[PDB]
């Protein structure tokens, strides 16, 4: 799925159709983008068989299950309250979960796509979310090094940070990937805000 | 290379442009590890490395 924001009056969307056929929807609205566009990373839009609907598709991912779609269930995918219509861009479900995300971003103190913003606000947004990520891994290792008891020393602390984070997240809490998922979707929001400037 | 990336990422799906972007930290400024990016997109590190191997190789032909 490829959202190409052209001149800031509209956009174009590249999606799959049938068995990996290429289709593009022009005249895609960029205002009220919150409604229909999924911020998940675990889902993507696909042109319906009779192409007048954009319907969800669950991607291979260990991310949480948003939009009520857990496994590409056709009875949910074809439902009108779980898919968008080309022309009247609702969602829906997508709007609910995305509003929840925009609530999370509000909690963190990050600029949201619902209210006014410029390039500066978005730049500050990414700059802050970076701090959030760094702090998150820092805490994920901090509250992890309590077992020890002195096994750390200068043997464990050997390279690398990738290895350290791997061994630390290996037995980390289950909520960590939920928070990471939230931050991912928020990141996608900030990205949408960035490309809209 | 900074100007070529913004066109090379426009030839990739959004979900790949975003893993490369998060990893290399374009707008983020800072750099994200393979594990962090893998956690953000819910996929293993090897896969992310495959995306990198697909994108960085596109800067040739």
UniProtKB/Swiss-Prot annotation, chain B:
DNA-binding region of this protein: 34-53
Sigma-70 factor domain-4: annotated segments: 8-61
Top-level lineage group: Bacteria
Subcellular location: Cytoplasm
Domain notes: Contains 4 domains, connected by flexible linkers. In the active conformation, the domains are in an extended conformation, each making extensive interactions with the RNA polymerase catalytic core. In the autoinhibited state, sigma-70 factor domain-1 packs closely together with sigma-70 factor domains-2 and -4, contrary to the extended conformation that is seen when the protein is part of the RNA polymerase holoenzyme.
Protein function: Sigma factors are initiation factors that promote the attachment of RNA polymerase to specific initiation sites and are then released. This sigma factor is the primary sigma factor during exponential growth.
Subunit structure: Interacts transiently with the RNA polymerase catalytic core formed by RpoA, RpoB, RpoC and RpoZ (2 alpha, 1 beta, 1 beta' and 1 omega subunit) to form the RNA polymerase holoenzyme that can initiate transcription. Interacts (via sigma-70 factor domain 4) with the phage G1 protein gp67; this inhibits rRNA synthesis. Interaction with phage G1 protein gp67 does not inhibit transcription in general, but selectively inhibits transcription from promoters that require interaction of the RNA polymerase alpha subunit with DNA sequences upstream of the -35 promoter element.
Protein family: Belongs to the sigma-70 factor family. RpoD/SigA subfamily.
Full protein name: RNA polymerase sigma factor SigA
Source organism per UniProt: Staphylococcus aureus (strain NCTC 8325 / PS 47)
Included stretch of the parent chain: 296 to 356 of 368
């Amino acid at each position: 799925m490829k959202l190409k924001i052209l001149d800031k009056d509209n956009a174009t969307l590249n999606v799959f159709h049938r068995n990996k056929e290429h289709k593009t929807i022009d005249n895609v609205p960029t205002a009220n983008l919150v409604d229909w566009y999924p911020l998940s990373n675990a889902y993507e839009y696909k042109l319906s068989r009779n192409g007048e609907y954009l319907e969800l598709k669950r991607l291979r991912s260990t991310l949480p299950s948003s939009y009520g779609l857990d496994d590409n269930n056709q009875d949910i995918i074809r439902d009108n309250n779980h898919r968008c219509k080309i022309g009247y861009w609702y969602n829906p479900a997508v709007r609910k979960d995305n509003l929840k995300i925009i609530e999370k971003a509000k909690q963190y103190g990050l600029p949201i796509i619902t209210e006014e913003y410029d390039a500066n606000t978005v730049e500050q947004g990414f700059r802050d979310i970076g701090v959030i990520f760094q702090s998150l891994k820092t805490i994920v290792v901090t509250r992890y090094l309590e077992g020890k008891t002195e096994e750390e020393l200068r043997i464990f602390n050997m390279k690398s940070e990738e290895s350290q984070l791997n061994e630390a997240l290996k037995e980390s809490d289950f909520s960590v990937d939920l928070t990471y998922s939230d931050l991912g979707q928020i990141y996608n929001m900030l990205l949408l805000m960035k490309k809209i400037s | 290379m900074k100007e070529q990336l913004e066109d090379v990422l426009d030839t990739l799906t959004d979900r790949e442009e975003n893993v490369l972007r998060l990893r290399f930290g374009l707008d983020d400024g800072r750099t994200r590890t393979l594990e962090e990016v893998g956690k953000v997109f819910g996929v293993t590190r090897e896969r992310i490395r495959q995306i990198e191997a697909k994108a960085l190789r596109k800067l040739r032909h």
